[PDB]
Amino acid sequence: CGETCLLGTCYTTGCTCNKYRVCTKDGSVLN
């Protein structure tokens, strides 16, 4: 879930915003 929280937060479910302002589901960017 290598999406970015450009809007502020991930719109994808289960994806969290990591310090790099990037969504992480499990921890892998390739998700």
Side-chain angles (χ1 to χ4, degrees):
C1 189
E3 177 58 287
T4 51
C5 322
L6 296 178
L7 298 178
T9 312
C10 311
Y11 277 44
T12 332
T13 42
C15 305
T16 51
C17 293
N18 103 72
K19 183 269 157 296
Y20 194 44
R21 197 174 180 174
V22 176
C23 306
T24 39
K25 225 188 194 68
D26 53 343
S28 319
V29 184
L30 188 64
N31 194 306

